[PDB]
Write an enzyme that holds these catalytic residues in place. Structure first.
Site, PDB file in Angstrom:
ATOM      1  CB  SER A  50      -0.974   0.038   1.186  1.00 40.88           C
ATOM      2  OG  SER A  50      -2.004  -0.932   1.057  1.00 40.88           O
ATOM      3  CE  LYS A  53      -4.648   2.313  -1.200  1.00 40.00           C
ATOM      4  NZ  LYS A  53      -4.125   1.078  -0.560  1.00 40.00           N
ATOM      5  CB  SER A  98      -4.951   1.744   2.980  1.00 38.05           C
ATOM      6  OG  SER A  98      -3.841   1.385   2.177  1.00 38.05           O
ATOM      7  NE  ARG A 226       1.452  -1.296   9.683  1.00 38.94           N
ATOM      8  CZ  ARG A 226       0.434  -1.246   8.835  1.00 38.94           C
ATOM      9  NH1 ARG A 226       0.579  -1.583   7.563  1.00 38.94           N
ATOM     10  NH2 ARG A 226      -0.759  -0.848   9.272  1.00 38.94           N
TER      11      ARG A 226
HETATM   12  C1  LIG Z   1      -1.870  -2.259   1.399  1.00 42.47           C
HETATM   13  O1  LIG Z   1      -0.820  -2.355   2.010  1.00 42.47           O
HETATM   14  N1  LIG Z   1      -2.969  -2.893   1.806  1.00 42.47           N
HETATM   15  C2  LIG Z   1      -4.284  -2.264   1.823  1.00 42.47           C
HETATM   16  C3  LIG Z   1      -4.672  -1.997   3.262  1.00 42.47           C
HETATM   17  N2  LIG Z   1      -3.676  -1.110   3.815  1.00 42.47           N
HETATM   18  O2  LIG Z   1      -3.757  -1.108   5.244  1.00 42.47           O
HETATM   19  S1  LIG Z   1      -2.486  -0.467   5.945  1.00 42.47           S
HETATM   20  O3  LIG Z   1      -1.494  -1.572   6.023  1.00 42.47           O
HETATM   21  O4  LIG Z   1      -2.961  -0.136   7.292  1.00 42.47           O
HETATM   22  O5  LIG Z   1      -1.968   0.496   5.017  1.00 42.47           O
HETATM   23  C4  LIG Z   1      -4.701  -3.314   4.026  1.00 42.47           C
HETATM   24  C5  LIG Z   1      -3.381  -4.085   3.895  1.00 42.47           C
HETATM   25  C6  LIG Z   1      -2.875  -4.210   2.451  1.00 42.47           C
HETATM   26  C7  LIG Z   1      -3.570  -5.339   1.691  1.00 42.47           C
HETATM   27  O6  LIG Z   1      -3.734  -6.435   2.222  1.00 42.47           O
HETATM   28  N3  LIG Z   1      -3.962  -5.059   0.446  1.00 42.47           N
HETATM   29  O7  LIG Z   1      -4.260  -6.190  -0.340  1.00 42.47           O
HETATM   30  C8  LIG Z   1      -5.670  -6.489  -0.308  1.00 42.47           C
HETATM   31  C9  LIG Z   1      -6.258  -6.213  -1.662  1.00 42.47           C
HETATM   32  N4  LIG Z   1      -7.734  -6.044  -1.581  1.00 42.47           N
HETATM   33 CL   LIG Z   2      -2.798  -0.280  -2.609  1.00 38.43          CL
END
Ligand SMILES: *C(=O)N1C[C@H](NOS(=O)(=O)O)CC[C@H]1C(=O)NOCCN
Ligand SMILES: [Cl-]
Ligand SMILES: *C(=O)N1C[C@H](NOS(=O)(=O)O)CC[C@H]1C(=O)NOCCN
Ligand SMILES: [Cl-]
Ligand SMILES: [Cl-]
EC number: 3.5.2.6
Lengths: 241, 236
Positions: A50, A53, A98, A226
């Site tokens: 993520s 982004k 996100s 984190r």
């Molecule tokens: C990106 O890192 N993502 C999207 C979302 N971000 O949460 S954060 O880690 O708090 O930035 C959740 C974790 C992660 C994913 O798992 N994305 O893949 C899922 C696709 N739908």
């Molecule tokens: Cl993303």
């Protein structure tokens, strides 16, 4: 004489306290010197997840895929696991929560040809978009190290990326995470199987500290580590109180 | 039909608790409705004092008096009462610490002709710069009401003021006061003899609440405003 990157292994205690391992990389902009607990891992390239982004937002804005940070992107109606995703979003909230499906649609509208060209112009990681244009940063070939994240973020901070100043200002606005009388944090989290990320910077009255951290994450538990581990390093270095 | 403006006198308790009197004005952007504890005072005009740093910044940037938010304004070496003023500043820290000598210098460089033309284009208060070119917002002829502060701030939020979009974005960055997972506040404080101000807005996930408060006369400015915001369930 002094080195560009100084190793401070004492930060490993902050990872050890939480039964984890990782790297924090700091860059003191005024002093033009960096600090990290693991010089090797600072240069190890991982999927950005993520954290992608940030460049995705820049490209989408510069091409007009996103007109501005207020434009509403309607929920596609499909209920997903993360409840905050099942609603309408703008760029500010899509970053904050996100919201992957919003950003997948951005990437599809950008298209592979322009995505590849922009990432080359950004000197971003290994610049490799092999995979699907709407998932290469999640499960494709792109890889970026913590030190490469710093280099990219320093360009963004200084409006030096090969996109408009406006695009860069809007993305920096969207990165706003925390602000008080002591500091301002602009940053983006990320997580993919086994690696959690936090990259960004801390703005002080008269200096800026860039940071990029990644850590091993066997499960989705401990995502709060984190920011917590990073802040323990920031506190130890007297960057925040 | 519904009312664009509603009065809620229960907010007076937040002023009375501190042996003060004043007005808080709120504007719900999504609903296009406003709320205040004192309809009359909401529309009465006062000196803007340091809240004038918002238009002053926009004008200085748009005219190129200030190149960007990184340009350094060197301390002139005169020790002043507010310790944070006795150092070099940029636009971000000059706003944050409300550094008067930096903004007097902006105003002198802008000059009377350009300042007046800009305030007229901004529809800013009574648009009157009579007095000293570098102090009229503290002891000259300019006046603005709390509702007029909101109308100006809404234009700034939407990039609708006549100055460049860039200038508007930079000033909104410089107005950043507080941000967390619940809200973002962009605002500016002010104090003229006998009136304290706090004006700005609260950004939520899917709405914006503009606010302008003034009160008879410093931490009470934010504290009282936040009690109103908490009562109205805008912030936790
Ligand atoms: C990106 O890192 N993502 C999207 C979302 N971000 O949460 S954060 O880690 O708090 O930035 C959740 C974790 C992660 C994913 O798992 N994305 O893949 C899922 C696709 N739908
Ligand atoms: Cl993303
Ligand atoms: C503007 O209202 N100022 C400058 C400074 N602002 O602090 S704030 O009220 O916290 O934003 C102090 C108060 C005020 C003055 O200029 N007061 O000094 C009056 C003497 N010329
Ligand atoms: Cl002022
Ligand atoms: Cl901002």
């Amino acid at each position: 004489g002094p080195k560009e990157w100084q190793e401070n292994k004492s930060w490993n205690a902050h990872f050890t306290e939480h039964k984890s391992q990782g790297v924090v990389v700091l860059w003191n902009e005024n002093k033009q010197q960096g600090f990290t607990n693991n010089l090797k891992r600072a240069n190890q390239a991982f999927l950005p997840a993520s954290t992608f982004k940030i460049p995705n937002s820049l490209i989408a804005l510069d091409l007009g895929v996103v007109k501005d940070e207020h434009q509403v992107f309607k929920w596609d109606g499909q209920t997903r696991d993360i409840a905050t995703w099942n609603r309408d979003h703008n760029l500010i909230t899509a970053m904050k929560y996100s919201v992957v499906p919003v950003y997948q649609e951005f990437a599809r509208q950008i298209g592979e040809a322009r995505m590849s060209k922009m990432l080359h112009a950004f000197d971003y990681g290994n610049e490799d978009i092999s995979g699907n244009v709407d998932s290469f940063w999640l499960d494709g070939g792109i890889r970026i190290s913590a030190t490469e994240q710093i280099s990219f973020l320093r360009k963004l901070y200084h409006n030096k990326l090969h996109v408009s100043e406006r695009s860069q200002r809007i993305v920096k606005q969207a990165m706003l995470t925390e602000a008080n009388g002591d500091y301002i944090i602009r940053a983006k989290t990320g997580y993919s199987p086994k690696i959690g990320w936090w990259v960004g910077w801390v703005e002080l009255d008269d200096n800026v500290w860039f940071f990029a951290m990644n850590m091993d994450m066997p499960t989705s538990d401990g995502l709060g580590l984190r920011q917590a581990i990073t802040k323990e390093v920031l506190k130890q270095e007297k960057i925040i109180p």
